[PDB]
Amino acid sequence: DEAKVTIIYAGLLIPGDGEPLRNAALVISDKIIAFVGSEADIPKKYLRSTQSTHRVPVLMPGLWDCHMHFGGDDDYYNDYTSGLATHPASSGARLARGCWEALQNGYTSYRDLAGYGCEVAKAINDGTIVGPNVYSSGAALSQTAGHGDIFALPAGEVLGSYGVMNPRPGYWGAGPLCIADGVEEVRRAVRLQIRRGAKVIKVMASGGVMSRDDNPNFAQFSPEELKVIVEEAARQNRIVSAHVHGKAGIMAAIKAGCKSLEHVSYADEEVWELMKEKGILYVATRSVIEIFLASNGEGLVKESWAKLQALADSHLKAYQGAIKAGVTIALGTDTAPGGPTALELQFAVERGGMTPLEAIKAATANAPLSVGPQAPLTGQLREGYEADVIALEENPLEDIKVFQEPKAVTHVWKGGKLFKGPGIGPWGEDARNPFL
Amino acid sequence: DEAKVTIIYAGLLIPGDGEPLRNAALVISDKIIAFVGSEADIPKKYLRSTQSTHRVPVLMPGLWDCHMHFGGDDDYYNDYTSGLATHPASSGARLARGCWEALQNGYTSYRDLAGYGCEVAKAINDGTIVGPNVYSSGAALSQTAGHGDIFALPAGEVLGSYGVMNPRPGYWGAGPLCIADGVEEVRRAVRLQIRRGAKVIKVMASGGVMSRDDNPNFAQFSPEELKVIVEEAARQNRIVSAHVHGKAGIMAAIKAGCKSLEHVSYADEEVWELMKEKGILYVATRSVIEIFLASNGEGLVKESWAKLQALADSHLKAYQGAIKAGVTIALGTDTAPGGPTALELQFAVERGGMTPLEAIKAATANAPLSVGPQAPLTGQLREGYEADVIALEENPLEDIKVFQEPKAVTHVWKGGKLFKGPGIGPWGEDARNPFL
Amino acid sequence: DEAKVTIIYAGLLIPGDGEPLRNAALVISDKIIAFVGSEADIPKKYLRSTQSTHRVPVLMPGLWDCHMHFGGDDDYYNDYTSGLATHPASSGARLARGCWEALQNGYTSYRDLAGYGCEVAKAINDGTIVGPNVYSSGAALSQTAGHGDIFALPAGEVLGSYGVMNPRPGYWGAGPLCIADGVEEVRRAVRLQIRRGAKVIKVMASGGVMSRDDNPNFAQFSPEELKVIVEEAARQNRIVSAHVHGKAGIMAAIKAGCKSLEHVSYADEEVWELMKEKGILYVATRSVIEIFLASNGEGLVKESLQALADSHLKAYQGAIKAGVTIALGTDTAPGGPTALELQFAVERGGMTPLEAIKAATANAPLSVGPQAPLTGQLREGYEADVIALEENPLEDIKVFQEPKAVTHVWKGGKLFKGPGIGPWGEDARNPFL
Amino acid sequence: AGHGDIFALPAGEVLGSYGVMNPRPGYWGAGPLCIADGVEEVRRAVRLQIRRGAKVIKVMASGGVMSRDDNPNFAQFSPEELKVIVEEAARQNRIVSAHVHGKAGIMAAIKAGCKSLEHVSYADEEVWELMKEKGILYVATRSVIE
Ligand SMILES: [Zn+2]
Ligand SMILES: [Zn+2]
Ligand SMILES: [Zn+2]
Ligand SMILES: [Zn+2]
Ligand SMILES: [Zn+2]
Ligand SMILES: [Zn+2]
Ligand SMILES: [Zn+2]
C-alpha cells in the first residue's frame, strides 16, 4: 500500500566510496536507500511522508567481514577434529549467539568460507533468529591430504564424513568440509554446496597453518581440478575464493580463474599486477597472525609454528605492497561469528598502512566483490543500494579502534529494518516470539 | 492368411500435413494405412475385400503429446518428494487409468520425459491394459543440485535412490530421476535408461520452476557432460530432448547436439535461426504456465513464483516468434497421462497464434520428430503410415476447443485396432480378460 | 445433506447366512444396508425418500476371494524369479486391469496374501481406479529356504531384496516377500507389513509345491518364531493366516495361534476338531490343484503330487462333513478365475450351492478377523456391498463363470456396474483433470 | 511402524537414518528418533541415548495421532521389549516416560515399570489406582488437543 520511510540526519556521513559528508541526511524507503546528500537538499516528498527520524553523529554503511567460519565447535578438541565430532545442533545453537553479537556490532554481511552458513541462514531468513546477511560456501573444498584434511584421524573416518562418494543417511554432502580428488569428484563437490544454497565457493589451493601436516609453500589441487571448480561455479554465477599462501598456489588459483584470494602470504610484484589486471579481490586476514604472534602460541597446536616469522613477515609485506600497488582489498578476520572482526580494521590501518577511510572502504564498498554476481547493490550509502546502515557515537576516522567497542554502535539497519537502536529489543523491532 | 481391411469415409479428412480433404475415404490393411483420397477414387480391390465400414464427419490422425510425465504420484507430498516416496506399484496402478483416458481422448502416442513409461509400456504391450504408444526416456538425467534434484531432502537420500554408483537391490537404475555428475557417470546414466527400453533421452540442461532452489536463467551440466550424453544416445539411435529456459542452457543444448528443446523460455532471434538451421524440435509446453497463471499459485509451492511474469512473458514471446520465424513445432502439456493435453492445442492457436490447421500438424505430423529415428512412419493419414486414426463429431478447424470434450472423439484406432468406437468395450475390440 | 437411498426388489434374495428369501426387497442408506425383508414389509419412510429403484431376479452379497496374490508379474520367468525381476510399476499397471475385472465379476472383497495389495489399494481408495475391497498382508513371511524363497537365485540376491536387515534406498521392506530368521528378525518382518498398511499377516508355516526345492510334509519356522509373529499381529489387531500342507506345519500353526489356514492338505480328524474348538478358518484353495491336474502340469516347473492332490481333497471333504468353518480362496492374480472355486466347493468338497455361497460371503470376513467390518451378508447395518444376477446360482453354480450374468455391483453403496453405468462406475470423472 | 515412524517415507530411508544397525558417518545414533525392533536392538537404543547424555528415556508404547497411519487404541513394543528398556534405563538411574493412549499400551507400560505416562487418554478407575499405588507421574499434555 504505502512505503515505510525513515529519515536519518548525520553529523558525519561516510558513504563507503568517495569523500565523507558533513551534516548530511539519508532516506530509507522500505528495504532500500532513497536519498543521500546534505541535510538541506532532502526531497520534500519524503519530509511529508516519513514516520521516523533519527539524528546521529556518524553514519556509515553496514560492515562486512569477508572470511568467517560458521563452526560453532565444542571446546573439547583443539584441532579440526572438533569440526567432525561436534554435533551440528550444538553448532547451530552456538552460531545463533554469534550471529546476534555480529549484528549487535554493526556487521550486516558475512562471507562464511567454511561451515553451516547455509543451514543457519535459513533460521535467520525465516526470522527465527537474527543475524547478518550470510553468503556461505557450504563446505570448503579440499583435496585428500589438503589443508582441509584432519590429519590426526584415519583417512577412512574423514572421507566417510566428507567425501563425494557413497551417499548415505546422516546429511551426506552437508558438512564443513568436502574432500574431492579428481575432475569427476570436484564436479559433485561444487554442486553439493550449490545444493545447500551456497553463494560462493571455497577451495584450499595451497597448504595451511591450521591443518597439522601440510606445508603452505606448496600448491594443492591440480590446475585441471581448479579449472573445473571455477567453471562449475561460473555456470551458477558463483565465483571461487581460494585460500593460498605459497606463490605456487597463488598463481595456480589465478590461472584457474579464482576471483578472491585469502591470506596471499607470498604475494609479490608479479601477483599484485595480476590481481589488478584480472580484478581479483585480495583478503589478507591479518587478525589471525597478529592474534597468535601476541599470544605466542596459546590456543594452538605445537605444529602451528608453521606460521613462524618467515610466514608472518612475508604475509605483511604482501599486504603492504598490495595496498601500495593499488590492489582491490577487502577485510576478513577468519573467526566464528561474534568474534573480534573489528580488529581487522585496526590492522588494516596499523599494519597494512591504510588510511581509516580506505579501511572502511575495504570493509564496506569493496566487500560485496567477495561474492561477485551474488551481491546486490550494497555496502555503500548511496541511492538505490540496500538499506544496510549503522550509526555511531564516535568518529572512526580519528580513532579506528572505536569499532572494538560494541556500545559505540547505536543503530543497526539491515534491509531497512531496525535491529539495534534506542529502546529496541534484543531481536529487533516489532519483534514477536516466532513459536506462538 | 488374409489381410483385415476397414474402410472409413469422412466428411472432412485432415491428414496432418497438407490441405484437408472433402468427402474423402481412408483404408486400413491390418496395422497400416492402405489408401487415402476422395471417396470416388477408392481401389475396387479393397471394396471387394473389406469387412468393416464407417462413415464419420471428421477424420484425422491420432494425437501426440510430446511432454508427459509418467509419475502416478500419491497426493501426499506437493513437491518432487512424492516422486521418491510413492511406491511404483501405486504409480503403476494410477498410470493405468491415465493411459486409458488418454486413449479415450484420441491420444495414440505419448513421449514420456520422466517416469515409469518404460515399465508401464510393457503392460500396454502385452495387452494387459491399453494406452497410447509410449516413447519413454526412463528417468530424466539431472546433475546434483539440478532441476531434477529434490532439494528438500538430504543429498544422501536422493543419491542413494537415484545415483549411478553403488548398485543395490531395490530396482537401482529404474526411477523417475537419475543423478549423474561427470563424464564417467553420465555414460552409465544414458545407458541405464536404454536398459529399461527408453526410446529418447531427457536432460535437464537448465534450472527449472518445479524444483525448489534452482534458477532457470543458468545452464546445467557441463558442455563436456552433454556432448557425451548426446553421443551415447546417438550410438543407440536415440536423440536427446533438453529442458531449457535461460539462453545459456539453450545454446549449450544446441551445441551438444540435442534435437528437441522443452519450454525454451528465453528463445530469441538467434535461437530460432539455429533450431531451423540445425533442425531442432521446439516444444513450448505452454499449458503449465497458463494453468497456474489462472490458478494464481493454487497447487504449487510458494518458491514457484520463479515462473513470475518475467518468465511467463518471455516464454510467450519465444513461442510466438518461433512460430513466426517458422521453427518446427510440436505440442507437449507436461502432465500425467489422462491429464488435459487437449488444452495445449487451444494455447497453440490462442497464445502462439497458430491456425488450427497448423496446431493439428504440431500435434500429429510433426510430433514423431520428437523421438527421431525411433519413430515409424506415423502421425499422418497417408499411404504406408501407421494406422493410428481418430474420428470426430465436430470440426476442430472451426472450434479448436472441441478436443476438450472426450465424447467428441468417437473412434480410436491404434495399430489398425479399434479401441473406442460404437458399441466397443472399455478395453477395445475383441477384448478378453487377460487373467483367464 | 440427506441420506442417499436406493431400493432393490429381488425375485430371490440370498443373504449369506440363513435361508434365501422370495420376492424380497433391500434398502441402502448411503454406505450401509438399511433394510432386508419381503417386498411387502419395506418401511414407508424409505419409500418416501428413495431416489433410485431396481428390480432384479437374484440378489446376494458381494463375493470374496480369500487367497489372492497381487503379483502382476511379467510373463518372462516361470518361477518366483518373476516376482523379484518384475518392476512394481509394471505390476501395478497390470493389477489395475485385474481389479477392474474382479469388480466386474461381483467380487467386492479380496484377501491378498502376497504382493502389492497395500500399495495398489491406495489407488483404489483415492478413486484413481476401481477394485474390490482389498485386505493385504503386504509380503508373505518366509524363513530362509522356506516356501517363499527363490531357490534358483543365489541367497544373497534374495535376502538383499527381501531381508529385514540392511535398510537401503529402493523401497526396502515393501516387496511380495519377506525373509526373516529368528525371533528378532520376525518382529521387524511383521512390523514392516503393518507399516505398509497390511490388514492380515501371512506366514509360510510349511513347505510348498510352487517353490522349486522345499518339501510340503515338513514344518517351517520355529514354534518360537510363529508365537512371536502371532503376538505381533495380535497387538495391532491383525490375525495370522498360515499356509500349510503337512500335519507338522498345520499343528505348529494352530499351536502358535494362527486363525486361518490355507490348503491344509493333510488335515485329518484331529485337525478338524481343533479348527472348530479353536475357531480357525479353513481355506482349501482347490482351484490350483484342479487347474493343474486338468492341465496335466503344463505351465509349471518339473518339481510339481497326485498323492498330495488326493490327501488335499479328503481334508477338504472331511472338514466340510465335520463342520469346520470354511471360506473360499482361488490363489490367483486379480481378475483370475475365482468363480471356479465355488464350483469345486460344491462338486469336490460336496457342499450345497447355498453353503458354497456362504463360504464366499458370510464367512469370508472371518479371514481378516477384527479388521473386518460388518459385511459379506445382506442384512441391516452391514456394509452395502451387493450384487445382482440374471440366473439362479442355487440351480446352477457355474453361473458365476459368466461375467455378463452379474448385472449390478454395489460396493460401499456406490454402483460400479449396472445398466448404462460406465466402466469406472457411477458419476465417474477423470481424476487427472 | 510405531508412533515414531515416518510412514510417508520408504522404510529404508527411515531406518538408515534412525535404526540401531549399520553404524556410519553422519552422527549415527544422534537424531530425534530411534527405531529398534527386538530385545537386542532396544538395548542399543537405550544406550545410544545415554551416550548423548540423556537424563530420561522416552518410548512410544501406543499408537499416536501426530503419526500418519497408526491407531492409538493399540499397544506398541512387546512387553518383552519394554521390560528391557526399563531395566536398561534403571541401571543408569534413568526412568522411562511412556507415551500412551489406549488402555492396552497404558497397562503394558505400567507392567514394564515406566514411571511417567503422557496423554494417558483412556485412563480409567483401574489406571488411576495403579499410578498411585505404583507412584507413576501422569502428564496429560492437554494443550495439543485444545
Ligand atoms: Zn584460510
Ligand atoms: Zn579460513
Ligand atoms: Zn521441463
Ligand atoms: Zn517436464
Ligand atoms: Zn499357499
Ligand atoms: Zn499362496
Ligand atoms: Zn506423545
Side-chain angles (χ1 to χ4, degrees):
Chain A
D1 56 349
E2 313 275 57
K4 190 188 236 224
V5 182
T6 299
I7 311 198
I8 309 165
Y9 308 85
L12 182 66
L13 184 143
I14 303 164
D17 201 5
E19 288 304 295
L21 275 48
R22 278 286 161 202
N23 301 300
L26 183 145
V27 187
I28 293 176
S29 188
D30 294 294
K31 299 173 159 207
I32 60 92
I33 293 186
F35 168 87
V36 194
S38 75
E39 168 172 347
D41 296 326
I42 295 165
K44 52 175 135 58
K45 163 172 174 162
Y46 293 132
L47 291 169
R48 224 174 293 90
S49 52
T50 171
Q51 327 86 55
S52 170
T53 314
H54 310 274
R55 193 171 283 277
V56 306
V58 163
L59 197 74
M60 70 181 276
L63 293 166
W64 282 57
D65 192 279
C66 296
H67 191 140
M68 294 288 301
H69 284 316
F70 276 58
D73 307 306
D74 295 342
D75 203 23
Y76 193 75
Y77 288 118
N78 305 129
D79 64 351
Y80 286 164
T81 309
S82 75
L84 175 167
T86 303
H87 190 298
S90 306
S91 301
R94 292 195 196 88
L95 284 164
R97 177 64 183 284
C99 283
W100 187 85
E101 298 279 356
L103 207 48
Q104 225 63 4
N105 275 79
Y107 281 85
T108 66
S109 279
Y110 271 164
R111 189 180 70 162
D112 156 38
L113 297 179
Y116 299 118
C118 296
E119 290 61 28
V120 178
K122 37 185 58 165
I124 282 172
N125 275 23
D126 61 6
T128 295
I129 63 171
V130 309
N133 284 304
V134 165
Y135 301 85
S136 173
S137 65
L141 282 58
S142 174
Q143 59 157 83
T144 282
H147 170 69
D149 203 335
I150 306 166
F151 287 81
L153 286 175
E157 271 67 11
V158 180
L159 271 101
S161 286
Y162 301 133
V164 295
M165 63 217 58
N166 305 345
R168 50 161 179 74
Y171 311 102
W172 187 76
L177 176 72
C178 181
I179 298 198
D181 302 298
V183 172
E184 300 294 290
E185 275 192 39
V186 297
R187 285 191 187 284
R188 173 132 59 237
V190 172
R191 293 164 181 176
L192 286 169
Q193 314 322 304
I194 303 291
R195 207 184 134 85
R196 309 165 68 179
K199 297 199 180 179
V200 62
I201 295 296
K202 173 83 170 310
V203 280
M204 311 303 196
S206 132
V209 170
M210 251 42 152
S211 47
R212 128 145 136 38
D213 267 35
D214 61 350
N215 177 347
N217 286 311
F218 307 153
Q220 293 185 356
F221 280 121
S222 51
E224 301 100 69
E225 282 160 294
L226 300 171
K227 181 180 138 173
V228 168
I229 290 164
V230 164
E231 288 169 343
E232 285 290 339
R235 190 147 51 241
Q236 305 302 134
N237 238 26
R238 271 66 165 178
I239 51 141
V240 177
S241 177
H243 151 125
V244 286
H245 286 310
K247 200 188 200 212
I250 295 178
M251 303 290 288
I254 290 175
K255 192 108 182 297
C258 297
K259 299 296 294 187
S260 175
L261 307 167
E262 326 296 317
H263 323 278
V264 204
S265 308
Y266 288 81
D268 71 339
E269 206 213 42
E270 205 189 330
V271 171
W272 308 322
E273 296 312 301
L274 267 167
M275 298 187 63
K276 301 192 294 168
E277 219 110 31
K278 278 185 202 229
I280 301 163
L281 192 63
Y282 184 120
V283 181
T285 317
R286 183 66 184 186
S287 286
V288 71
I289 295 175
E290 302 285 77
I291 291 159
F292 291 116
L293 274 172
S295 190
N296 222 59
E298 262 79 26
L300 285 169
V301 198
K302 64 222 166 192
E303 294 105 339
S304 303
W305 181 31
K307 161 205 315 192
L308 229 180
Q309 255 224 121
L311 178 94
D313 282 336
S314 305
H315 180 254
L316 185 63
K317 268 193 305 308
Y319 196 13
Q320 293 174 334
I323 290 154
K324 284 151 40 58
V327 176
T328 296
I329 291 167
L331 297 190
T333 305
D334 191 345
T335 46
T341 49
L343 280 196
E344 186 60 38
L345 281 150
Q346 194 196 319
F347 299 119
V349 179
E350 292 180 1
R351 305 306 229 107
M354 319 197 170
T355 73
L357 183 57
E358 289 152 6
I360 298 300
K361 175 175 157 176
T364 33
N366 288 348
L369 290 165
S370 76
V371 295
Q374 287 301 328
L377 285 184
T378 195
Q380 297 193 42
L381 299 185
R382 247 175 71 237
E383 184 168 344
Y385 283 44
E386 290 234 277
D388 288 5
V389 190
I390 61 168
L392 264 53
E393 190 73 7
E394 295 199 323
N395 176 222
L397 300 182
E398 310 282 81
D399 192 20
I400 194 80
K401 293 171 270 199
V402 59
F403 292 108
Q404 285 133 254
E405 190 26 74
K407 289 167 185 188
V409 175
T410 46
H411 295 75
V412 182
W413 279 278
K414 184 196 95 166
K417 175 193 185 81
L418 189 51
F419 283 103
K420 186 188 187 184
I424 292 284
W427 305 101
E429 77 181 329
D430 301 319
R432 61 162 308 266
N433 178 354
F435 301 87
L436 296 170
Chain B
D1 56 349
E2 313 275 57
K4 190 188 236 224
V5 182
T6 299
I7 311 198
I8 309 165
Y9 308 85
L12 182 66
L13 184 143
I14 303 164
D17 201 5
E19 288 304 295
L21 275 48
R22 278 286 161 202
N23 301 300
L26 183 145
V27 187
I28 293 176
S29 188
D30 294 294
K31 299 173 159 207
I32 60 92
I33 293 186
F35 168 87
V36 194
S38 75
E39 168 172 347
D41 296 326
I42 295 165
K44 52 175 135 58
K45 163 172 174 162
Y46 293 132
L47 291 169
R48 224 174 293 90
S49 52
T50 171
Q51 327 86 55
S52 170
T53 314
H54 310 274
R55 193 171 283 277
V56 306
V58 163
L59 197 74
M60 70 181 276
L63 293 166
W64 282 57
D65 192 279
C66 296
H67 191 140
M68 294 288 301
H69 284 316
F70 276 58
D73 307 306
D74 295 342
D75 203 23
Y76 193 75
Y77 288 118
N78 305 129
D79 64 351
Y80 286 164
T81 309
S82 75
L84 175 167
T86 304
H87 190 298
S90 306
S91 301
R94 292 195 196 88
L95 284 164
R97 177 64 183 284
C99 283
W100 187 85
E101 298 279 356
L103 207 48
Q104 225 63 4
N105 275 79
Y107 281 85
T108 66
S109 279
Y110 271 164
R111 189 180 70 162
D112 156 38
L113 297 179
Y116 299 118
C118 296
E119 290 61 28
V120 178
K122 37 185 58 165
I124 282 172
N125 275 23
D126 61 6
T128 295
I129 63 171
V130 309
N133 284 304
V134 165
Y135 301 85
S136 173
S137 65
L141 282 58
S142 174
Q143 59 157 83
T144 282
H147 170 69
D149 203 335
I150 306 166
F151 287 81
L153 286 175
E157 271 67 11
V158 180
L159 271 101
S161 286
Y162 301 133
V164 295
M165 63 217 58
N166 305 345
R168 50 161 179 74
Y171 311 102
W172 187 76
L177 176 72
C178 181
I179 298 198
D181 302 298
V183 172
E184 300 294 290
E185 275 192 39
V186 297
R187 285 191 187 284
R188 173 132 59 237
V190 172
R191 293 164 181 176
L192 286 169
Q193 314 322 304
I194 303 291
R195 207 184 134 85
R196 309 165 68 179
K199 297 199 180 179
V200 62
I201 295 296
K202 173 83 170 310
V203 280
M204 311 303 196
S206 132
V209 170
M210 251 42 152
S211 47
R212 128 145 136 38
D213 267 35
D214 61 350
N215 177 347
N217 286 311
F218 307 153
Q220 293 185 356
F221 280 121
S222 51
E224 301 100 69
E225 282 160 294
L226 300 171
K227 181 180 138 173
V228 168
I229 290 164
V230 164
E231 288 169 343
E232 285 290 339
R235 190 147 51 241
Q236 305 302 134
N237 238 26
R238 271 66 165 178
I239 51 141
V240 177
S241 177
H243 151 125
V244 286
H245 286 310
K247 200 188 200 212
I250 295 178
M251 303 290 288
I254 290 175
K255 192 108 182 297
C258 297
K259 299 296 294 187
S260 175
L261 307 167
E262 326 296 317
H263 323 278
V264 204
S265 308
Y266 288 81
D268 71 339
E269 206 213 42
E270 205 189 330
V271 171
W272 308 322
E273 296 312 301
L274 267 167
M275 298 187 63
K276 301 192 294 168
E277 219 110 31
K278 278 185 202 229
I280 301 163
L281 192 63
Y282 184 120
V283 181
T285 317
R286 183 66 184 186
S287 286
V288 71
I289 295 175
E290 302 285 77
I291 291 159
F292 291 116
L293 274 172
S295 190
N296 222 59
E298 262 79 26
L300 285 169
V301 198
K302 64 222 166 192
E303 294 105 339
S304 303
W305 181 31
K307 161 205 315 192
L308 229 180
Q309 255 224 121
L311 178 94
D313 282 336
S314 305
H315 180 254
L316 185 63
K317 268 193 305 308
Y319 196 13
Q320 293 174 334
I323 290 154
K324 284 151 40 58
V327 176
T328 296
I329 291 167
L331 297 190
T333 305
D334 191 345
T335 46
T341 49
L343 280 196
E344 186 60 38
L345 281 150
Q346 194 196 319
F347 299 119
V349 179
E350 292 180 1
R351 305 306 229 107
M354 319 197 170
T355 73
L357 183 57
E358 289 152 6
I360 298 300
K361 175 175 157 176
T364 33
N366 288 348
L369 290 165
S370 76
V371 294
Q374 287 301 328
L377 285 184
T378 195
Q380 297 193 42
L381 299 185
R382 247 175 71 237
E383 184 168 344
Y385 283 44
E386 290 234 277
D388 288 5
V389 190
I390 61 168
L392 264 53
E393 190 73 7
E394 295 199 323
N395 176 222
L397 300 182
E398 310 282 81
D399 192 20
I400 194 80
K401 293 171 270 199
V402 59
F403 292 108
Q404 285 133 254
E405 190 26 74
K407 289 167 185 188
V409 175
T410 46
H411 295 75
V412 182
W413 279 278
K414 184 196 95 166
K417 175 193 185 81
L418 189 51
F419 283 103
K420 186 188 187 184
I424 292 284
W427 305 101
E429 77 181 329
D430 301 319
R432 61 162 308 266
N433 178 354
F435 301 87
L436 296 170
Chain C
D1 259 347
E2 179 45 57
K4 188 189 239 230
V5 181
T6 299
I7 311 198
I8 309 165
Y9 307 86
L12 181 67
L13 184 143
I14 303 164
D17 197 292
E19 294 306 10
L21 285 156
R22 276 286 168 211
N23 303 300
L26 183 145
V27 187
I28 294 176
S29 189
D30 294 293
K31 290 204 152 209
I32 60 92
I33 293 186
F35 169 87
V36 193
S38 75
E39 169 166 359
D41 295 325
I42 295 166
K44 53 175 136 57
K45 68 167 175 161
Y46 292 131
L47 291 169
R48 225 174 299 95
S49 53
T50 172
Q51 328 94 37
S52 170
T53 37
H54 310 273
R55 196 167 290 271
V56 305
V58 163
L59 197 74
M60 70 181 276
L63 293 167
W64 282 57
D65 192 278
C66 296
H67 192 139
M68 294 289 301
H69 283 315
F70 275 58
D73 296 341
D74 294 342
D75 204 24
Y76 194 75
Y77 287 120
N78 284 326
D79 69 2
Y80 286 163
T81 310
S82 75
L84 175 167
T86 303
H87 191 298
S90 307
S91 300
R94 293 196 195 90
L95 284 165
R97 177 64 183 284
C99 283
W100 187 87
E101 298 278 355
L103 207 48
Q104 288 277 323
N105 274 286
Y107 281 86
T108 65
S109 280
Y110 272 165
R111 190 179 70 160
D112 159 45
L113 296 179
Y116 299 119
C118 297
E119 290 61 27
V120 179
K122 239 144 165 162
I124 281 173
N125 272 298
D126 60 6
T128 295
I129 63 172
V130 309
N133 284 305
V134 166
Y135 301 86
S136 174
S137 65
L141 300 203
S142 175
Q143 58 158 83
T144 281
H147 169 68
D149 206 339
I150 307 167
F151 285 82
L153 286 175
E157 276 79 334
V158 180
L159 271 102
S161 295
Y162 300 132
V164 296
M165 75 281 288
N166 308 347
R168 50 163 175 73
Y171 312 102
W172 189 77
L177 176 71
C178 180
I179 288 146
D181 300 297
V183 173
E184 301 294 288
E185 276 189 33
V186 298
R187 285 191 187 285
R188 175 132 58 239
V190 171
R191 293 164 180 176
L192 285 169
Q193 313 323 303
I194 279 153
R195 206 185 132 88
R196 308 165 68 179
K199 297 198 180 179
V200 61
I201 295 295
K202 174 83 170 310
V203 280
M204 311 303 195
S206 123
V209 171
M210 279 316 291
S211 47
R212 179 220 199 204
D213 293 346
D214 69 317
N215 177 348
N217 284 309
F218 306 153
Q220 293 184 358
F221 280 121
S222 56
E224 299 104 291
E225 280 160 293
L226 300 171
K227 182 179 138 173
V228 169
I229 290 164
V230 165
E231 288 168 342
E232 285 292 338
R235 189 149 51 240
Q236 303 300 321
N237 240 22
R238 272 66 165 179
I239 52 141
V240 177
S241 178
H243 152 125
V244 286
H245 285 310
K247 200 188 200 211
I250 296 178
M251 303 290 289
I254 290 176
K255 196 132 172 287
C258 296
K259 293 218 75 100
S260 175
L261 307 166
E262 326 297 316
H263 322 280
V264 204
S265 307
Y266 288 80
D268 70 339
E269 166 99 33
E270 206 193 325
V271 171
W272 307 322
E273 295 317 313
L274 266 167
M275 299 186 64
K276 302 193 294 168
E277 201 142 71
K278 278 185 203 229
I280 302 163
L281 191 63
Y282 184 122
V283 181
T285 318
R286 183 65 192 188
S287 286
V288 302
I289 295 176
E290 300 285 350
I291 292 159
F292 292 117
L293 276 172
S295 187
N296 218 51
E298 282 151 23
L300 284 168
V301 197
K302 183 52 169 192
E303 292 105 335
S304 311
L305 206 86
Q306 230 152 106
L308 176 137
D310 299 10
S311 303
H312 179 254
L313 185 64
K314 177 234 177 84
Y316 197 14
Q317 293 175 333
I320 290 154
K321 283 164 156 156
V324 176
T325 295
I326 291 166
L328 297 190
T330 303
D331 191 351
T332 46
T338 48
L340 264 75
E341 186 61 15
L342 281 150
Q343 194 195 318
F344 300 119
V346 179
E347 292 180 358
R348 312 290 307 181
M351 21 178 126
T352 71
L354 184 58
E355 287 152 8
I357 294 184
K358 175 175 157 177
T361 34
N363 289 346
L366 291 165
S367 75
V368 294
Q371 287 303 324
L374 283 182
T375 195
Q377 298 192 43
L378 299 185
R379 185 193 194 150
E380 185 167 345
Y382 284 41
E383 289 234 276
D385 289 3
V386 191
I387 61 168
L389 263 54
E390 197 175 0
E391 292 244 320
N392 185 22
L394 300 182
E395 300 162 27
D396 192 20
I397 194 80
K398 294 165 89 194
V399 293
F400 293 109
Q401 284 132 254
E402 191 24 75
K404 275 217 271 293
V406 175
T407 46
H408 297 75
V409 182
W410 279 278
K411 184 196 97 167
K414 176 189 205 293
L415 189 50
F416 284 102
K417 185 188 188 184
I421 291 285
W424 305 103
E426 79 181 329
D427 302 319
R429 271 136 38 265
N430 177 354
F432 301 87
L433 296 170
Chain D
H3 169 68
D5 206 339
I6 307 167
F7 285 82
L9 286 175
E13 276 79 334
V14 180
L15 271 102
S17 295
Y18 300 132
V20 296
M21 75 281 288
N22 308 347
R24 50 163 175 73
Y27 312 102
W28 189 77
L33 176 71
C34 180
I35 288 146
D37 300 297
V39 173
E40 301 294 288
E41 276 189 33
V42 298
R43 285 191 187 285
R44 175 132 58 239
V46 171
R47 293 164 180 176
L48 285 169
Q49 313 323 303
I50 279 153
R51 206 185 132 88
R52 308 165 68 179
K55 297 198 180 179
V56 61
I57 295 295
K58 174 83 170 310
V59 280
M60 311 303 195
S62 123
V65 171
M66 279 316 291
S67 47
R68 179 220 199 204
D69 293 346
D70 69 317
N71 177 348
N73 284 309
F74 306 153
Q76 293 184 358
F77 280 121
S78 56
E80 299 104 291
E81 280 160 293
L82 300 171
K83 182 179 138 173
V84 169
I85 290 164
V86 165
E87 288 168 342
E88 285 292 338
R91 189 149 51 240
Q92 303 300 321
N93 240 22
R94 272 66 165 179
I95 52 141
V96 177
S97 178
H99 152 125
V100 286
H101 285 310
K103 200 188 200 211
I106 296 178
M107 303 290 289
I110 290 176
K111 196 132 172 287
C114 296
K115 293 218 75 100
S116 175
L117 307 166
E118 326 297 316
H119 322 280
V120 204
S121 307
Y122 288 80
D124 70 339
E125 166 99 33
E126 206 193 325
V127 171
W128 307 322
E129 295 317 313
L130 266 167
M131 299 186 64
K132 302 193 294 168
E133 201 142 71
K134 278 185 203 229
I136 302 163
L137 191 63
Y138 184 122
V139 181
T141 318
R142 183 65 192 188
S143 286
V144 302
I145 295 176
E146 300 285 350

